[PDB]
Amino acid sequence: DIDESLYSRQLYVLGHDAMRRMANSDILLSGLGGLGLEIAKNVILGGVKSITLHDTATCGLHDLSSQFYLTEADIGKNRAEASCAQLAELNNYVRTVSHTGPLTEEFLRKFRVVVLTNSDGEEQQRIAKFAHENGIALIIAETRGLFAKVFCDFGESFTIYDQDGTQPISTMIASITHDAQGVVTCLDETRHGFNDGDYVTFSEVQGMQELNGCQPLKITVLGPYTFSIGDTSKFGEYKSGGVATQVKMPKTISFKPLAQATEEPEFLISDFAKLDSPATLHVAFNALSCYRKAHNGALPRPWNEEDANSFLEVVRASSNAEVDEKLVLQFAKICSGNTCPLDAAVGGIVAQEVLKACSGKFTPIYQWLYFDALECLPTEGVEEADAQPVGSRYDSQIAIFGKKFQEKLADSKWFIVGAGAIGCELLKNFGMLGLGTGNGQIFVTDMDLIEKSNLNRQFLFRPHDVQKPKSMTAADAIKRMNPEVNVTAYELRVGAETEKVFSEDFFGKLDGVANALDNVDARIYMDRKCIFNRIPLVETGTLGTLGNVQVIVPFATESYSSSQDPPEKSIPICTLKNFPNAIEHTLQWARDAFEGVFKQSAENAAQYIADPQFTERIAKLPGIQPLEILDSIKKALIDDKPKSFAHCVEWARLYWEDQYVNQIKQLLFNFPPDQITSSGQPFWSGPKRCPDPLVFDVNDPMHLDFIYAAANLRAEVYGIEQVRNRETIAELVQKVKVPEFKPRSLDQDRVDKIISELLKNADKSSKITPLEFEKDDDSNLHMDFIVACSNLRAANYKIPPADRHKSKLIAGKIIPAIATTTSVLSGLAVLEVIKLIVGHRDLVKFKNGFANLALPFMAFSEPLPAAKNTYYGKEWTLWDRFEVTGELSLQEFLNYFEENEKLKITMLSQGVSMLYSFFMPKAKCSERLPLPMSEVVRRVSKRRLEPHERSLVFEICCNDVDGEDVEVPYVRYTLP
Amino acid sequence: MQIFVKTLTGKTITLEVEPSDTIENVKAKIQDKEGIPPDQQRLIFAGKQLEDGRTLSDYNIQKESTLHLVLRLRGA
Amino acid sequence: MQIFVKTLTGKTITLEVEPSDTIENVKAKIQDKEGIPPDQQRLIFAGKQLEDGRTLSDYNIQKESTLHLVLRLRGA
Amino acid sequence: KSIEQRYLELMKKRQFDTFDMIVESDNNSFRFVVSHHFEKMVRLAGDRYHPSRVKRLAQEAVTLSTSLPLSFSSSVFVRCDTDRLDIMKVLITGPADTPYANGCFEFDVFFPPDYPNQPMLINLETTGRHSVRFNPNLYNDGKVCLSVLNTWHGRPEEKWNAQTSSFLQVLVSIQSLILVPEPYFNEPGFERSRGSPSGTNSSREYNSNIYQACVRWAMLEQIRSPSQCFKDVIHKHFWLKREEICAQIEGWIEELGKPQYTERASRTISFNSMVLRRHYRHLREELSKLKPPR
Numbered sequence A: 001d002i003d004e005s006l007y008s009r010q011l012y013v014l015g016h017d018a019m020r021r022m023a024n025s026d027i028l029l030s031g032l033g034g035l036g037l038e039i040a041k042n043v044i045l046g047g048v049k050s051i052t053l054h055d056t057a058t059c060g061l062h063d064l065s066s067q068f069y070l071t072e073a074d075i076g077k078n079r080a081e082a083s084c085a086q087l088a089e090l091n092n093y094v095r096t097v098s099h100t101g102p103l104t105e106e107f108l109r110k111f112r113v114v115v116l117t118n119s120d121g122e123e124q125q126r127i128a129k130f131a132h133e134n135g136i137a138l139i140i141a142e143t144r145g146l147f148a149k150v151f152c153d154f155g156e157s158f159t160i161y162d163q164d165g166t167q168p169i170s171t172m173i174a175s176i177t178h179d180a181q182g183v184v185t186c187l188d189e190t191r192h193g194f195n196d197g198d199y200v201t202f203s204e205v206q207g208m209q210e211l212n213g214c215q216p217l218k219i220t221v222l223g224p225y226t227f228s229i230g231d232t233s234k235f236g237e238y239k240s241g242g243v244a245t246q247v248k249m250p251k252t253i254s255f256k257p258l259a260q261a262t263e264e265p266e267f268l269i270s271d272f273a274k275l276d277s278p279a280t281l282h283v284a285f286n287a288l289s290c291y292r293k294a295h296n297g298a299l300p301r302p303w304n305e306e307d308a309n310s311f312l313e314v315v316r317a318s319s320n321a322e323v324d325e326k327l328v329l330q331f332a333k334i335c336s337g338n339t340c341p342l343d344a345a346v347g348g349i350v351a352q353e354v355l356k357a358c359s360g361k362f363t364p365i366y367q368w369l370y371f372d373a374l375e376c377l378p379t380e381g382v383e384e385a386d387a388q389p390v391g392s393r394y395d396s397q398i399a400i401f402g403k404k405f406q407e408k409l410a411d412s413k414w415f416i417v418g419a420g421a422i423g424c425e426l427l428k429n430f431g432m433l434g435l436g437t438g439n440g441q442i443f444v445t446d447m448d449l450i451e452k453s454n455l456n457r458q459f460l461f462r463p464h465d466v467q468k469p470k471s472m473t474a475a476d477a478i479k480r481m482n483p484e485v486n487v488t489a490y491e492l493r494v495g496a497e498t499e500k501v502f503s504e505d506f507f508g509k510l511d512g513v514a515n516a517l518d519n520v521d522a523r524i525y526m527d528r529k530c531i532f533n534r535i536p537l538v539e540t541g542t543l544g545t546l547g548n549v550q551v552i553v554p555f556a557t558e559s560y561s562s563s564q565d566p567p568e569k570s571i572p573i574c575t576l577k578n579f580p581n582a583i584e585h586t587l588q589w590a591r592d593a594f595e596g597v598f599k600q601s602a603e604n605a606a607q608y609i610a611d612p613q614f615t616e617r618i619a620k621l622p623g624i625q626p627l628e629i630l631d632s633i634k635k636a637l638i639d640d641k642p643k644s645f646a647h648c649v650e651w652a653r654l655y656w657e658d659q660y661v662n663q664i665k666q667l668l669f670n671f672p673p674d675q676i677t678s679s680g681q682p683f684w685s686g687p688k689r690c691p692d693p694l695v696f697d698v699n700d701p702m703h704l705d706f707i708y709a710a711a712n713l714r715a716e717v718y719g720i721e722q723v724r725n726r727e728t729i730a731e732l733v734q735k736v737k738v739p740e741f742k743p744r745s746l747d748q749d750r751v752d753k754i755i756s757e758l759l760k761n762a763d764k765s766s767k768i769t770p771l772e773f774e775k776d777d778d779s780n781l782h783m784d785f786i787v788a789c790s791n792l793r794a795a796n797y798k799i800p801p802a803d804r805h806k807s808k809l810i811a812g813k814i815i816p817a818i819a820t821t822t823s824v825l826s827g828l829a830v831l832e833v834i835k836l837i838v839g840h841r842d843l844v845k846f847k848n849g850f851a852n853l854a855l856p857f858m859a860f861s862e863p864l865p866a867a868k869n870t871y872y873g874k875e876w877t878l879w880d881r882f883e884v885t886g887e888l889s890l891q892e893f894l895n896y897f898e899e900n901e902k903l904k905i906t907m908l909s910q911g912v913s914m915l916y917s918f919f920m921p922k923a924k925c926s927e928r929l930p931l932p933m934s935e936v937v938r939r940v941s942k943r944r945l946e947p948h949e950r951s952l953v954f955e956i957c958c959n960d961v962d963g964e965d966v967e968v969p970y971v972r973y974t975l976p
Numbered sequence B, C: 001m002q003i004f005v006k007t008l009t010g011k012t013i014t015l016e017v018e019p020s021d022t023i024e025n026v027k028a029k030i031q032d033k034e035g036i037p038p039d040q041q042r043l044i045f046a047g048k049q050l051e052d053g054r055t056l057s058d059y060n061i062q063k064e065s066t067l068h069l070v071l072r073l074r075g076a
Numbered sequence D: 001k002s003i004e005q006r007y008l009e010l011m012k013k014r015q016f017d018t019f020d021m022i023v024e025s026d027n028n029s030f031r032f033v034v035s036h037h038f039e040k041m042v043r044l045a046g047d048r049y050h051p052s053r054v055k056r057l058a059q060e061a062v063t064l065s066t067s068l069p070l071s072f073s074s075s076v077f078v079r080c081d082t083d084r085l086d087i088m089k090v091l092i093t094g095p096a097d098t099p100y101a102n103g104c105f106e107f108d109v110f111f112p113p114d115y116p117n118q119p120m121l122i123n124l125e126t127t128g129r130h131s132v133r134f135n136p137n138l139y140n141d142g143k144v145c146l147s148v149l150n151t152w153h154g155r156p157e158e159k160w161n162a163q164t165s166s167f168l169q170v171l172v173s174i175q176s177l178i179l180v181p182e183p184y185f186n187e188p189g190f191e192r193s194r195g196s197p198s199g200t201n202s203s204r205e206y207n208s209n210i211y212q213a214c215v216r217w218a219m220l221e222q223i224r225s226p227s228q229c230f231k232d233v234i235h236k237h238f239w240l241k242r243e244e245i246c247a248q249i250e251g252w253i254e255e256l257g258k259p260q261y262t263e264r265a266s267r268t269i270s271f272n273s274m275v276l277r278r279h280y281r282h283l284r285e286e287l288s289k290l291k292p293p294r
């Protein structure tokens, strides 16, 4: 089977069937330049059966611009042979070999997918014809400076099993009309979300039982809440119930051969503001081969006018269709160079296409993809003398941007937050770019350690690097790849608690920040820091095949916090408590039960055992908190303490009985199963599923699994040695006596009594230890207990059970991730970083990125300008602020604002604190008025001011002279 | 005039809108048909992000044009 | 003729239903104002049930009468 | 002046005030001097906050300083931390002609850092140490149920809305939908059984239980051990209306003494009546000891 411990994140994106299909596919990769290297790396991380690296060119100085696996000592050797040794270490399950012979017809028959890079026109045509004639998938990829070209030909009949990769959506039916155009209405006016022309199946339908398990039927969406399935008069009348589930219909398409698709190309639009670009780029790429043939196999010289004119003439002679002459000239001017982020992005795209060819999942490119990043070039262009090679490893980059931009890159300082997959790819791209190799630096921080599941998508880490810090290992790896890179690594988590290191002086010398985090709080904190220090910030985020990039420029664009994302979906309280109807509800309930039983029930006992004077601290707590703590401690230490593993088994059996018999019986007693409302709908109808108490059976694998997991976890909590024998557990659990259950329709003295009970009866020699929920370990029985609990609750309410895979996905809050999306998004982010470093300020040059490699889809948009507001006729944005210097009292602060800005402050706040307000008590207001602002902040925040703090940020709500509220920028208060 | 809105997840939306209507109206129609609140919608057309207070005529949205409903992600 | 029906904002608004109108007709005439489905509405008089099959005359609801309309109040 | 006029004039000034809930502690830490349910979540949140949260909370405070409901029947009092607007406590008095009438119910409100995108968290404290379920929407563990408090799919008009929804809206929703005169029918499905003798008997049983529950916890425990934030307001409210609560409890007792049609409900009603007499004797004992406020 598939090794889930390594491909855990990738499985949620691909699937078991897709991964099985890729495990039987052989890949041949021709050309081992930078683009070929990225393609091979991403494919190997994908986990194909085998990959063969074929190349005829030899390593040169120009290849070091993008190939991170070649060094100066590798000059003169074959690129494929030199890179094969390092490429094999990425994945031990993939057999990697190197080939140097000619690509004969018999040799090509051994590969399912063939990738061609840097191949000439005749070889490309011959191999494409052979592959199409013999049913072999072919992909042709090229990169010329700031341009890209991808071609896909997957055969005469290619079958796709999942066209979009989205999970099926199921809805619940309330009523179905019985006529020739039967209309399905969803429950209590809830949107089904079904697309027009979708195929659905029906289950759990009463009355129209013929529709149960029927073949998928084409639907017609008549509205947001209704749709038609056709003639339903041939079936019986509809009583109630029913669940309609979307079904993914496979699609079969035909790919034209290259020799035909050249004349009639279908373009996948890469940028919707450049609809005419692909038509010109097709002709330019086609005529590049003719120009090479006409000039002794030499590409046009960098930024040479004569060569550009010659290439334009060649393009004019080659094709009769009108083309953008300026675009052709630019392409000819920068065709001889090569850059790393473009290679990474195109490599990610091509690797995703290879995976699509292997597994048959997702819709491939149909058929050509052309992309460009001309906005990275300076507006005035690059002088030809500036683009001449200087015998350096960045020669292919100087051929595009010039030596001056290389000098600017060498002196740049950039901060990368998070060293995950996106962080590692950003670090690799920055190192390959030469950023910080001069007087600059690259800072990277991460608080996490390397885990085995991280190796699937993070190529900077090795199996022997587990338990090591991510940041230091990544820094060492990229130092090995490029010795000139200067990197400073930290093991800190960005936030208010680490401002000692990431102080204002640290951000003062920075030129930008790149975000590679996985949570919103860190993103907001980094946004606040970047706004306060006025430095550009680049935001990247991925989710499976989805990805996005947002660029923030000071004084130009809005911030990441200016817009809002959908909130996290919570579960209604009753749905979690008494009336679950989906497996997610039962999984959340199981997680809550696990936490409450194995963690929250033992924290107080552990604290009491560890701290001898815990009782005297908890005796001073206000309210009924001391009683709530002492009673829990007593219950955990005396009443429910098991003295043997048999007691643990008995406790597990009793807990099972209460959770799946007693509470359900009580719920049914409160609400009878056949309860009927006056108008006709039953109470246990629609979203409400009538439960039924279970009957304990030791022969049932689910019951035995739950008992085993619960008993083992309970023994682990109390320090009793675990008994990992299923037969022993089954034997022990059969002797437990279950008491009968029936449904049902001075404080100081108490605390003293309980304290006496703990000091007399309770023993401090116990080993109470709360359990921390860990999901990536298969030997801690956490996932087994969670699965057993959720499946038992599902069987309680006749909810279909979910296997361990879906339970781990949902309960563990796993974010699916793949390497190709990470590579593409990191390449785009590095392109935006290059744009920022160039010196661009017009929002037209910058482009926010959005991508979905499944469709495939990728579009760009200009970042929105910062919102403008006016007070007293003065325009201000989120980047503007007031400047208050020196040390002033609170009264002096208010008087300063009133006298200068003519604003009466009615509410002054510092972060979450509240220094001043109109409704504050008069005594506190009088006390705080003469004190200095620093002292007031220290008193209100209940924390000392650190020496590294040179300034404070205040938010004020002010009233104008006429008495109406006005929005004003925040205040920067400079400490003396 | 009839326009199409394509979500980043690949689902297609059909709207009945005459030009001159404020984006706010377009976002309200999209909310009625799917359910996302207006402030959580990001409409992209021809490399531009549609902002409130404008009409379709300024963005030259004509018949049978396609919009894109993109969203930000929290992974990494 | 005119009777009063309760709304979301606590206020009670003026509507044109008849005693001979069934509660289905009353629901339809409430619906024509805001598009609210008839099944979402529960017509109520002084805390007492009204449902589709009856007409307003069976509960002596006529001119100047008020209806405490609550939209099938939901829960946890 | 009439007693209602004096009540309205006296409690108008103390509707929205601030209290010292958090004090300075050693080694740059802070500790709670009052029992707040969301202390653990407050500590977990730390200093994280959305940029719009400060403006939203300032506008909310401006609204609450003037727009809190107030009447002889029911009133709402809000206390916030003197240094943090995101920590609040809410006291709601039961509306007249309801089982909660003249009963002080205390809530803990914490505004998450993602406010106003995420709905605020509110927890009921007057539950009698989790031994009393005052309402179907008020679980005995303290959780409070409202449709407005859910970001779940639901309906766009009923969901928590980042713009239209507000704290005052949530308070009014509680006051108008939870403390209803007939709490039994708040449960979905049971709402349509009203008008039947069985439904009437079930509602009478539930009301009889809630009567003694409120008399014990919302009145006697609040008088004996009032919260530090709501001490003087509770004292004034119970002193100004003591004859009214006495008369209302006596009327409840007379209503519970009426004959019952079914023995199953009759036994529970009689037991609740005895419990209510036992609690009302203690309440009368405590009321006479109330020193008149200045």
Ligand SMILES: *P(=O)(O)OC[C@H]1O[C@@H](n2cnc3c(N)ncnc32)[C@H](O)[C@@H]1O
Pocket: A417, A418, A419, A420, A421, A422, A445, A446, A447, A448, A470, A492, A493, A494, A495, A516, A517, A518, A519, A522, B075, B076
């Ligand atoms: P994905 O989860 O693969 O990568 C995210 C990485 O970022 C790190 N990270 C998350 N949050 C923070 C903060 N606040 N500071 C520093 N680093 C952070 C994760 O540990 C992952 O390595």
